[PDB]
Amino acid sequence: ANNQTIAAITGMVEMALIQSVCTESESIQLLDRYLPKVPPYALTSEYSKERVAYVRAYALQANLMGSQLALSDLASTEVKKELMAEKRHGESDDLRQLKQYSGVLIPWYNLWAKVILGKTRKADLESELSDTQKESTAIKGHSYSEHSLSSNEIANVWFDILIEAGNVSKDDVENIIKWSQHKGNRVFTP
């Protein structure tokens, strides 16, 4: 567990992109060499160390190919067949796990990747953000536990989006501080 290869490769690719050292074909070849084709286990365990790296890597590979990442891309065979059914009242627990622990992050990392590639910029950021905060919450459902990790994750990706966009201001960060005050919006000390 905690095989660090995906995080190091992703960091190398991000650094190469931001300095314009490489072409996108080289990046596609390199990511294609390393991303698994069958989805790996960590996407449905909330305490597996690897999960965020895979979510970031798949989102970046999807946006490099001009797509946008969707839940059906990360899904295994059984839950893909479930997502091709219609007359269902039921919903499997190993589907609700993938929605709860991975699904809420898909709207955010798409915007992050779009800002990284220069496809979305400062002049129209807020309309995306206010939309994205809605689009996540509709997926979110009942967080009956106070021990959810997801708020701590969302704060990090939000701050990274601001810092990467450029020309930040004090009020922008104060918005994150204000969002942290509601119940369940827990942010940890590191």
Binding site: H89, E91, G141, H142, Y144
Partner: protein, 292 residues
């Protein structure tokens, strides 16, 4: 002269042809206000003979017992030879149900014909209607879940909210109750017209109303207290929600959000104090029927 006789004949045919008119007549006789929309839908759904293995779920206080009593008295008013079994949680409830049945029989004019003939066995536990022949099994039997189930065969079985905190708090209690519920089916007679009905409200994370559906093949319908409160709560039931509620909520889905389904009896401020009596988990369990 003749006009009133024609009126009497038409009315006495019509009441045997329409459950909802019978409810209106009975509730005028009881000096109660007019039945609400959800009550009409519940009675109409109950009256349809095509549901053979059927469960109805509704929030607390809606009217289940009165509807059940009016149903069984109307059923024997239309066919006095039927065998009906009523199962309840405890002795007190069974006695209350049987007494209320006798009160309905004596209250209305024409139902007085159903009074029993000498050789009555007019007991509080079981009794015959007068038009029934002398026979082994009684017309109506009322019993608690721990009582004497053995010794008869039934055509119609009604369960009146058997699962209770007083009888499901321990592993032994749940196992015993599970055996008793999964043993009723041998009592039913094998004619094509026989049917069984459950009415109740879930009390715990495990509920037998879900076990009968997931394995034994029953079919269930749900009436929540208010229209769905968010999108993910709405996504919990699409086949299960009552057709009127789903038919409305497909269209006005933004304005209907969280609105009370029966404002004639239960306004928002009367539902709020329930959410002050109990935590949000309890309110969601008993009024939204969504166990977390």
């Amino acid at each position: 002269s003749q006009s009133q006789e024609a009126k009497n004949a038409l009315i006495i045919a019509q009441l045997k042809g329409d459950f909802v008119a019978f409810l209106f007549v009975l509730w005028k006789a009881l000096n109660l206000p007019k039945p609400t929309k959800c009550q009409i839908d519940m009675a109409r759904t109950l009256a349809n003979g095509d549901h053979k293995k059927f469960i109805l779920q509704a929030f607390r206080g809606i009217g289940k017992s009165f509807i059940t009593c009016a149903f069984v008295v109307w059923v024997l008013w239309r066919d006095p030879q039927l065998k009906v079994l009523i199962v309840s949680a405890s002795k007190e409830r069974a006695d209350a149900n049987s007494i209320f049945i006798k009160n309905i029989i004596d209250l209305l004019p024409f139902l007085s014909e159903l009074k029993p003939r000498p050789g009555q066995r007019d007991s509080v536990i079981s009794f015959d209607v007068g038009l029934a022949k002398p026979d082994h099994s009684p017309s109506v039997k009322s019993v608690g879940i721990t009582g004497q189930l053995t010794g008869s065969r039934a055509d119609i079985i009604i369960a009146d909210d058997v699962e209770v905190p007083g009888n499901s708090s321990t592993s032994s209690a749940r196992e015993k109750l599970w055996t008793l519920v999964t043993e009723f089916a041998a009592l039913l007679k094998p004619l094509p017209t026989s049917r069984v009905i459950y009415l109740g409200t879930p009390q715990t994370e495990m509920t037998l109303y879900k076990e009968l559906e997931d394995n034994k093949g029953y079919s269930t319908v749900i009436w929540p207290a208010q229209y769905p409160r968010n999108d993910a709560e709405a996504l919990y039931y699409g086949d299960r929600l009552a057709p009127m509620l789903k038919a409305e909520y497909d269209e006005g889905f933004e304005l209907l959000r969280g609105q009370p389904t029966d404002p004639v009896r239960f306004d928002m401020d009367d539902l709020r104090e329930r959410e002050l009596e109990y935590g949000k988990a309890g309110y969601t369990l008993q009024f939204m029927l969504n166990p977390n």
